[PDB]
């Protein structure tokens, strides 16, 4: 049997198969307090002489 000795649960581990390559979880840039979750960004400015 592929089931358990005493009560009905499978015993032969499991056979998984993903559909796609499964990337791009879309890590959101906003936390539970929602600031922006800043990382060091770019200035779009003139040279700071």
């Amino acid at each position: 049997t592929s089931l358990h000795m005493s009560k009905l649960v499978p015993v032969t581990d499991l056979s998984p198969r993903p559909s796609f390559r499964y990337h791009a979880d879309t890590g959101s840039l906003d936390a539970t307090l929602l600031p922006v979750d800043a990382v060091p960004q770019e200035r779009i400015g003139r040279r700071l002489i």
Binding site: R43, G45, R46, L48
Partner: protein, 426 residues
């Protein structure tokens, strides 16, 4: 309680907002990161006049940045005391008024004004009450003179009873930058005369005069000129945050210096300003403050008051100092220079005392003087306005986006009769 809302337009405005709020942070002990240090009660017992507590213990300015090109706001953000200002109070224009009054005012003064007055409404109505507005800008520029005046029009229409303080720097006759020079001056003047409460006249060649002749600087940068104005406009408002023996706010200044509501133009000065050559060699006494102040080498306007007549005056002192030497000096000027004061108003000046002197000086004084010497400034602007308006010069930049000939004719019509009514009280 009462809060003064600072608005600053043009790149002269954005630089003057950085330098005025660092002398305010100097009095208040405001650390550049936003906190406070100093351990004294008198700064923070009126801190709501300029600063808003931001639920983190830091004090943010009530300052409204304003310009049509983002370069001059990058410089004031990167500079020291630049992280004090809230970034949402910065408004960004992209096209820019290139020294042009008309396109500063109408068609690149319209897409930004609906968001910057949204900022002003958000900031002023959030406070429980108002004391007035203080708009510092330039009248020889494009965006500080074009749409800086249009904000003045719309907040006056919306909020009529609140005071309209405005520090405005003017064209310099000797040094001529912004070569379309009198058009920006005159078009801003004939609006500002009937649509303001108090206009304080700054002129860059007068500030060069007080760096060279009394302060003994060799290389005066724009930072020193910006620092000199910040002396005066901090001393005008010194009683809104510090107590005194004879107290005076901005409405105090408006009700006394203005005999007729149409004329409200003043010469401004600060005392004392000397170099380290004569820093240790002079007594900081009350007669020494007023003898140095009542002259042509200390005014921030390029008009000699000896050529005219002081219609009204106001000396507003600072520091721990005796009250007899206030009024005795302010009456000795009348008994000596009697011909330099008008006859149909007795006791032409107003005294005030701020108990707290500025940083490092035991006693100072600011001065707001309504004279008829402003008139000789307006003739010296008008004689260059009509010299190049008769010959139709540079008017294709002024008629191609919304004006006509009638608005130009009304411009000198509304300031030459200002000149004529300055004659009648001379």
């Amino acid at each position: 309680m009462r809060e003064i809302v600072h608005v600053q337009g043009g790149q002269c405005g954005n630089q003057i907002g950085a330098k005025f709020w660092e002398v305010i942070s100097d009095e208040h002990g405001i650390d550049p990161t936003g906190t406070y240090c100093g351990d004294s009660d008198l700064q923070l017992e009126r801190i709501n006049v300029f600063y808003n507590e931001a639920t983190g213990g830091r004090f943010v300015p009530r300052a409204i940045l304003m310009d049509l090109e983002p370069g001059t706001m990058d410089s004031v953000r990167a500079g020291p005391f630049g992280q004090l200002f809230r970034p949402d109070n910065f408004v960004f224009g992209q096209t820019g008024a290139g020294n042009n009054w008309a396109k500063g005012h109408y068609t690149e003064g319209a897409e930004l004004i609906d968001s910057v007055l949204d900022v002003v409404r958000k900031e002023a109505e959030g406070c429980d009450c108002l004391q007035g507005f203080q708009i510092t800008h330039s009248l020889g520029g494009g965006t500080g003179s074009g749409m800086g005046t249009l904000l003045i029009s719309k907040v006056r229409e919306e909020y009529p009873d609140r005071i309209m303080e405005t520090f405005s720097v003017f064209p310099s006759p000797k040094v001529s930058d912004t070569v379309v020079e009198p058009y920006n001056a005159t078009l801003s003047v004939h609006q500002l005369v009937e649509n303001a409460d108090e206009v304080q006249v700054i002129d860059n060649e007068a500030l060069y005069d007080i760096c060279f002749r009394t302060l003994k600087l060799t290389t005066p940068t724009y930072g020193d000129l910006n620092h000199l104005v910040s002396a005066a406009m901090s001393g005008v408002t010194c009683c809104l945050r510090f107590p005194g023996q004879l107290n005076s706010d901005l409405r105090k200044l408006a009700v006394n210096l203005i005999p007729f509501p149409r004329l409200h133009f003043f010469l401004i000065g600060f005392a004392p300003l000397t170099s380290r050559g004569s820093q240790q060699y002079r007594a900081l006494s009350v007669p020494e403050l007023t003898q140095q102040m009542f002259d042509a080498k200390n005014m921030m306007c390029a008009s000699d008051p000896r050529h005219g007549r002081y219609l009204t005056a106001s000396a507003m002192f600072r520091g721990r100092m005796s009250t007899k030497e206030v009024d005795e000096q302010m009456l000795n000027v009348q008994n000596k220079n009697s011909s330099y004061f008008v006859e149909w108003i007795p006791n032409n000046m107003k005294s005030s005392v701020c108990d707290i002197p500025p940083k490092g000086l035991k006693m100072s004084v600011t001065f707001v003087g309504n004279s008829t010497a402003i008139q000789e400034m307006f003739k010296r602007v008008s004689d260059q306005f009509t010299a190049m308006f008769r010959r139709k010069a540079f008017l294709h930049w002024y008629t191609g986006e919304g004006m006509d000939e009638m608005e130009f004719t009304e411009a000198e019509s509304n300031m030459n009769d200002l000149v004529s009514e300055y004659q009648q009280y001379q």
